[PDB]
């Protein structure tokens, strides 16, 4: 993670989990890495058991989380003096959105008994609405690159974790040393054997 906090000051990092430094002390095996862009006025409702506009139509959170969100200001890469409609938000779903699952659709949503199969009626609205990102807009109407990480347990033995603070070497002195999972005490001496290369 050492190379994590050199990507401008963040926006919100409230967490219900473990510390970043003990992420180095505890070796993991599976972590989710997904990202999206939301307007800055709609990031505050990203919380476990939270209700808001983008709460049950694009992305929802369960109780057990093991992680938190990372967000920061992005006004020099996704903001244009004209228009920016590349990103869109969906707010029309028929039923409940399950936590941690993705959904993509293009069919028009029917809010009632109106039969719609490609026509935009007064009760049938398109479920995909685009944003608009201009420098005229203030802080509350700017895109934030919200990225969230979730950790998983009991899937595999640990296979991914950061540096272990390797040190220098000393010779001809009574000091403690440890090897590749082979811990012991002894005197390091150059050998004359012929090891096979496996």
């Amino acid at each position, epitope marked *: 993670y050492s190379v994590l906090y050199n990507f401008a000051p963040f926006f919100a990092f409230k967490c219900y989990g473990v510390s970043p430094t003990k992420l180095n002390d505890l070796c993991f095996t599976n972590v989710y890495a997904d990202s999206f862009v939301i307007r800055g006025n709609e990031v505050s409702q990203i919380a476990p058991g939270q209700t808001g506009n983008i709460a049950d139509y694009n992305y929802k959170l369960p109780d057990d989380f093991t992680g938190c969100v990372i967000a920061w200001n992005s006004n020099k890469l996704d903001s*244009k*003096v004209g228009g920016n409609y590349n990103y869109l938000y969906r707010l029309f779903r028929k039923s409940n959105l399950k936590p941690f699952e993705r959904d993509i659709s293009t069919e028009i949503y029917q809010a009632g008994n109106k039969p719609c199969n490609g026509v935009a009626g007064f009760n049938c609205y398109f479920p995909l609405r685009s944003y608009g990102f201009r420098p005229t807009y203030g802080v509350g109407h700017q895109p934030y690159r919200v990225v969230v990480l979730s950790f998983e347990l009991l899937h595999a033995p640990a296979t991914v974790c950061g540096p272990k603070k390797s040190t220098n070497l000393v010779k001809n002195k009574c000091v403690n040393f440890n090897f590749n999972g082979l811990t012991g005490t002894g005197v390091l001496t150059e050998s004359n054997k012929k090891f096979l290369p496996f």
Partner: antibody
Amino acid sequence: VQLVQSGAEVKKPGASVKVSCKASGYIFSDYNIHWVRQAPGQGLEWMGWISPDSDDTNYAQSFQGRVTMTRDTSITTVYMELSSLRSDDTAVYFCARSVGYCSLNSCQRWMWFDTWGQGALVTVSS
Amino acid sequence: PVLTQPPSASGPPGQSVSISCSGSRSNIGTNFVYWYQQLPGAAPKLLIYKNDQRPSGVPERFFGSKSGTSASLAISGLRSEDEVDYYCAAWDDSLSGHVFGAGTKVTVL
């Protein structure tokens, strides 16, 4: 906004023509430019968009290798290289000004063509 | 599919006329319809966008709307000093591009 350019010179079939319109008064890093021709007696046809930021330009189904698009940031003007002109190319050329920006294939429904002015003319000729 | 449009139109001055643009299921309704108008011997210009917002630069004279298969461009009255063709444009998901209508002549009576 302005689109002042020069008139296109007549080119033989199996050759190349160049049509380019000047862009000024705005930064050329957010507006994708479109090319389209006014076919007489019928509608118009489209081949793709041009993005001056990244190398992500695509092509239409009926226009695979007919057009080749090159970009330039020093002059902020798109450049034309047409190949194998035919008898159906008898139309005037206008560079379509499109507002906004869009890359993926579900965001192009929101924009509209902004500015037309002083188009050129490229048609095949025997 | 290709959008088709009336070749011409006959409307006397002083009374409102409208132009219809028949389409398909995936081209009209689920996608916005844009109306292009071009002067003879000059450059074209957009008339109406998104079927409910009027562009700046024109007075409150024209009107455009969509109703299912066809989109209607209401022309409240007609002046004999300006006769301009109207183009019909839409977007299709299968064709993945812009397809344009034939265009309609307007004449006085």
